[model samples]
Target: EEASSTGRNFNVEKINGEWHTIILASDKREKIEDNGNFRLFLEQIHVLEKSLVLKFHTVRDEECSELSMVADKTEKAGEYSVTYDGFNTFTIPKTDYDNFLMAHLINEKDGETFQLMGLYGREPDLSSDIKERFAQLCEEHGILRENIIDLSNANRC
Candidate 1:
């Protein structure tokens, strides 16, 4: 129901106390010029105690990943709602994620957009193991360590 940088083509439903990102069956290729071939690739699905998150992976001219977090006020089925409070989170190294985000914002990929993995419900919570893997990968790629940005409002700029 909302247009995002990835494109507008997703629906929400609550199933068994979990919210799911159901792809709209309707075809809207005309609405998305560059991303006309967009298809919904449902990633993982996670159910939390108080909230539900859905991540829809879409392939536009390049792979663009977006995450949507939803919360249910009551314990009723199909009563979950979503707002524009969600943001983009990547499992890649923080530097790669920063590059992707900046490239997306600047619309500059040199016409060679890379692939992005769509994460389901909740964004990837970088665990210690995952972080270590990322560090190793960065080292292998000859990249220097970079600090991950904490965008939470609770933290001062």
Candidate 2:
């Protein structure tokens, strides 16, 4: 599917009984090739402090190799958490962590799609301006405000 120009389409789901924020992707391979641009996008969102994991659906084992390569590049660039497992999956530990954001890129026919999943902490409260900016971003990206998770009152990771 063609993603909105604002580049937001987010959802939440449970995999193996663990709740996760899901980022929808396009169905085309070419659109998913520009990892550089994607990485820049993450940086623009100030994701340096958040936990990130790369999830991929591959039909063949070799496809995982490509995924690993991308994960490795991000890990090397220090954009990805050091805990990255060097495969189709990457993870950052939850520690003194106040915010969480994860992004997934998928290929589509005409272009690529972007999806974002977020988790916010309770302490060290966020400023109203920051919150408003984030909400504005979501609105611009076509993401429903309800889709953003608020783990503030919930249990810690």
Candidate 3:
């Protein structure tokens, strides 16, 4: 079904007796790291039970790029398969979604890091703890107290 607020499409159908939020394929690359975008995307899907799977097409150029960390961190390369020409997916389980989003900012050697609350972006420098830095960023981004996802009483899938 399509979300009227965000114009994003998703499926909320029962699979194996449990309802799953299935985000359909999109040509645009998802900015999963951006808190605002991530929250909006999740809101669009009306995620229940905190379960979601984002199935989208990614360019062949970024397929092999080191920026792809969800697969590497989770050691689930099978999910990032190129089904057809210049297409693949990076599936994010609700349990690991937060980490997947923050992975880009934590000691990422790839030069490009998250720009959180800054005129010129600052990195989680070696002097301070990275997790703490990420927490600070999360608070700044309104994700600390916000119901970014349904993680209350629902069990992690």
Best-fitting candidate, measured by TM-score?
2
- Taken over the whole model, the C-alpha lDDT of each candidate is 0.29, 0.29, 0.23
**Candidate 1 lDDT, 1-157, residue by residue in tens:** 1222222232222221221221111112221223432234334344566555554455555556664445443443323334321322222112222111110110113343222221111222323453454444444544334422211111110
TM-score of each: 0.30, 0.30, 0.17
| List of clashing residue pairs for candidate 1 | 53-121
Residues 29-115 of candidate 2 have per-residue lDDT tens digits of 222233312111111121212333333222232231112222322432222322222212222212122233333322222343344
The parts of candidate 2 lying over 4 Å away from their true place are 1-71, 74-114, 119-124, 155-157
Shift of residue 4 alpha carbon in model 3, Å? 38
Candidate 1 overall Cα lDDT vs. reference? 0.29
Which stretch of 10 consecutive residues in model 3 shows the poorest summed lDDT? 117-126
Model 1 is weakest, by summed lDDT over 10 consecutive residues, at 99-108
